[PDB]
Design a protein around this ligand. Structure first.
Ligand SMILES: C1=Cc2ccccc2C1
Ligand SMILES: [Cl-]
Ligand SMILES: [Cl-]
Length: 162
């Protein structure tokens, strides 16, 4: 198992513009195109990202190219984040994957109100953090996915994904 496989399972793969769990236009492997309600805005964002007139449809290759860029961006974001970096650096390789999944899904900004969980994680208090992470909108909204990421932090193994 790895970050790419882990996110591919959590995000799935769609080659035509769709709406995410929050109703935002997305495509590929969880690549958010826009928050705006305009499909056209979404199709324009799409062409701009791909570099061609896509018409709302991309290839598998193109989807995967976006995925790579997004995986990289996320890590790079965590590393530039002063609030995040230190936590992330304290973690073992499996848990780091879990931390990227979260940022990938909700952004640096989404992962902001997680201060108390961050601190518990940094402290290596797994069970307590597991509990704290569950008390969140994220958990209530996407419970199955949240349980997986949580188990991953709790255990430090890929069990939830196997
Ligand atoms: C959730 C935990 C954590 C730890 C380090 C970096 C980013 C994240 C997100
Ligand atoms: Cl992009
Ligand atoms: Cl879910």
């Amino acid at each position: 198992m790895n970050i790419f496989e882990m996110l591919r399972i959590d995000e799935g793969l769609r080659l035509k513009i769709y709406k995410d769990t929050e109703g935002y236009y997305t495509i590929g492997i969880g690549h958010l195109l826009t928050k705006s309600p305009s499909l056209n805005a979404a199709k324009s964002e799409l062409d701009k990202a791909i570099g061609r007139n896509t018409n709302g449809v991309i290839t598998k290759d193109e989807a995967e190219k976006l995925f790579n860029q997004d995986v990289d961006a996320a890590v790079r974001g965590i590393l530039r984040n002063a609030k995040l970096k230190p936590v992330y650096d304290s973690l073992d390789a499996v848990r780091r994957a879990a931390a990227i999944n979260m940022v990938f899904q909700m952004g640096e900004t989404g992962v902001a109100g997680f201060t108390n969980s961050l601190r518990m994680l940094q402290q290596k208090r797994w069970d307590e953090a597991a509990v704290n992470l569950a008390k969140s909108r994220w958990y209530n909204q996407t419970p199955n996915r949240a349980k997986r990421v949580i188990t991953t932090f709790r255990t430090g193994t890929w069990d939830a994904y196997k």
